[PDB]
Symmetry: C3
Subunit: 144 residues, 3 copies
């Protein structure tokens, strides 16, 4: 019942409308599990109480993080796939505040604020996993 | 005849190409009315003579606005729905100038400059309204 | 064989996953030629070893360019069409670095770094050309 009222089936996939306090990537993980999404693309917009990005450091194998608060999310773009049996969301975003200046990159997590988040999901029939590309030491989406 | 030559039907919705001087959100409103769009998602790009954003102030119930001139629109992302019988466009954007620095957020209005605006519209069969969410005092897209 | 393993057919078009060292717009040109794409929209994300943008100068008929290195591409949005028999890609992007500040605009070229690039392509049945709009001295996508 977690996702009750938070999405609708569309001809090409789903439309999701998340609400105050919803954890965006976790709700996309739950959609993947509830609807058994083989793989998907998505885009979205909304208003976030917090958005955390990471810039990956290959040397020390860690994301350097940064958190923004009470920001408009001008765009999110990403994919749904799987890794080790669990949903594996890969999302980027662009956020702006009352200066209107943009920031963002690779999303680690984000939470809807006093607003909503509209997400347009295009679902594919192929079950896709992500794997570590040994040439670069990063996760990449595998295609058939 | 307003929209003559400005869009084509696609398998999933429409593709719109707006031209010098066109008011982007107003042309999306007109597409909604002319094609009786129940609801839709969209993304787009273009070059704007002006783009006006707003950062909403919940205390005084007003957007603080900011206008940018002669800017590339690196992305727009949004939705078409209805409110009180009229089209209700919810759009965000990201704009850049000759410094290449990004800015944007919630769009209040924008006008195509010496360029064009390409808009990819995905149309859904469900008629959707936006409503004020009393928990947050903001418009949210209602789903069935 | 250039594009072997780099894309899959989807119900609405293609999904492309480009890899370290791939030239993004050139690979989209090659997809257009290999799959005889009449026209298309796309969005994408990835990590770029370099991304070059241009801000067009109408007076001297040239793009002023700027190159960013080792950047996350928070979004790309664009279209595939044709001009003089050759693919004509029109793409914008938004990139961020370890400051998380955003930059971008009109893309002249970009190369995948130690990462990948996921591209969601929506294909239309209509063959579209771009043409110079004599009122503005810029290329615009022509519609039927």
């Amino acid at each position: 019942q977690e996702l009750k009222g938070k999405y609708m089936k569309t001809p090409t996939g789903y439309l999701m409308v998340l609400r105050h306090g919803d954890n965006v990537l976790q709700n996309l993980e739950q959609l993947a599990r509830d609807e058994h999404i083989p793989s998907a693309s998505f885009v979205g917009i909304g208003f976030m109480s917090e958005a955390t990005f990471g810039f990956y450091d290959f040397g020390r194998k860690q994301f350097d993080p940064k958190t923004y608060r009470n920001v408009e999310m001008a765009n999110m773009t990403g994919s749904i796939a799987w890794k080790e049996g669990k949903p594996s969301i890969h999302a980027h975003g662009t956020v702006t505040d009352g200066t209107f200046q943009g920031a963002g990159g690779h999303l680690l997590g984000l939470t809807v604020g006093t607003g909503s988040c509209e997400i347009t999901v295009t679902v594919y029939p192929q079950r896709l996993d992500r794997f570590v590309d040994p040439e670069i030491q990063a996760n990449v989406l595998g295609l058939p």
